Structures are given as C-alpha cells and as structure tokens.
Design a protein around this ligand. Structure first.
Ligand code: URA
Ligand code: SF4
Length: 202
C-alpha cells in the first residue's frame, strides 16, 4: 500500500536510509539484496535522481557506482560540478530484474509506491535544483505524460514539489552507453550541457 507507512517523520538522512532498509512498500524488496538509499549530505544544493540501483549498486549499497555512474562522473567533471557537493538518489530504492542479473524498468505502480522516500529526501536536503536523469525519474515528479526528449535542458518549476526547486530533466547516462558509438560525442555533449543548466540556476 506504498512506502508511506514505512517512512519515519524525520529529516535525518541516516534514519531515513535505515528505515528504507525495512520497507515492504512494493514487491521489489523481495529479490533485491538491500535498499540503496541516496548518498550525500543535507548541505547539498543540487539533488540528482536516477531510475533505480543497478546490478553493482544493489551490492555496493551506493547509487551510481556501475558504468552508468562512471559516465555520470565523467559528465560531472566536464560540467565543473563536484559529486561530493551533491545528493544523489533514485526514483526506486530496490533493484528490479529478471534472469547475469538483468535490469527491468520499474512499473508506474512501483514508482508511485516508492515516491514517499523521495519526497522525504527532498524535504530534508532542500535542494535549489533537482536533476532528473531519465524518463522514470522525470515521470515521478512531472506526471505520466512527461517526455524527456521534448523538454531536456529547460528550467522547470512545478506546483506540487516540496521547496519549489528548479527542475531540469535529461537523459539517463545509460542511454548514452546503449547508444551507437558514432553519436556518443554529441549525446555526451547533450548531457554535459543539461547539467550546466542545472549548475547555473542561481
Ligand atoms: O544509481 C543508479 C545506478 C544505475 N542507474 C540508475 O538510474 N541509478
Ligand atoms: S521499492 Fe521503494 S517501495 Fe518498493 S519496497 Fe523498495 S523501498 Fe519500499
């Protein structure tokens, strides 16, 4: 019936993560190893939200540590942003997969179920800017009909979001990895640019 009953009313990030460890909000906690809560401290100005922990993250207990995360770090270095100044997290907290462990897009039901954790992280960190990496992260805050390819690199502000942070959407780093090698320099320039829009929001 949602993560809501499993969410403590606290701004402490460590208490949130520990309690996320006990969530039975949707079925995703069954096959994953552990919940992967975000990383960073409350002092961060910029929050970055991906889709879900992948194979590596599920085992490392940290978000964006696999290939997608390595590419994301290269894009951060190129955008002159430091990762330790950020708060990084995911729309869904448990890794969803089929049988190598193969990575399955979270369903809308799962996304709505896990959203209370994300709201809690936002009320705590109070970012000035949220960066949405990919479609599922973006739909999570902007509705089921939000299309990233149409609105990428635009400073968005929406009513319902806690704190009225600017919101900037972009492609998930793993889209670049999955894309053809010949477009990778233009796609990467695309991600780096959207990140610089977020960083240049005052
Ligand atoms: O933390 C992660 C890792 C891979 N993909 C994501 O969306 N988030
Ligand atoms: S995914 Fe989000 S909701 Fe479903 S179980 Fe893990 S934490 Fe609870």
């Amino acid at each position: 019936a949602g993560a809501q009953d499993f969410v403590p009313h606290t701004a402490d990030l460590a208490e949130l993560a520990a309690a996320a460890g006990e969530c039975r909000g949707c079925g995703l906690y069954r096959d994953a190893t552990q919940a992967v809560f975000g990383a960073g401290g409350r002092s961060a100005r910029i929050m970055m939200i991906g889709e879900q922990p992948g194979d590596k993250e599920d085992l490392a207990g940290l978000p964006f540590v696999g290939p997608a995360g390595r590419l994301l770090d290269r894009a951060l270095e190129a955008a002159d942003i430091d990762r330790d100044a950020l708060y990084v997290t995911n729309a869904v907290k448990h890794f969803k997969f089929t049988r190598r462990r193969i990575h399955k897009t979270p369903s809308r039901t799962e996304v709505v179920a896990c959203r209370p954790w994300l709201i809690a992280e936002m009320t705590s960190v109070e970012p000035d800017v949220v960066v949405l990496l990919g479609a599922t992260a973006a739909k999570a805050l902007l509705g089921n009909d939000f299309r990233v390819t149409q609105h990428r690199g635009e400073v968005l502000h929406v009513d319902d979001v806690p704190g009225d942070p600017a919101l900037v959407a972009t492609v998930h780093p793993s889209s670049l990895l999955r894309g053809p090698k010949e477009e990778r320099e233009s796609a990467f320039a695309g991600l780096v640019d959207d990140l610089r829009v977020a960083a240049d929001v005052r």
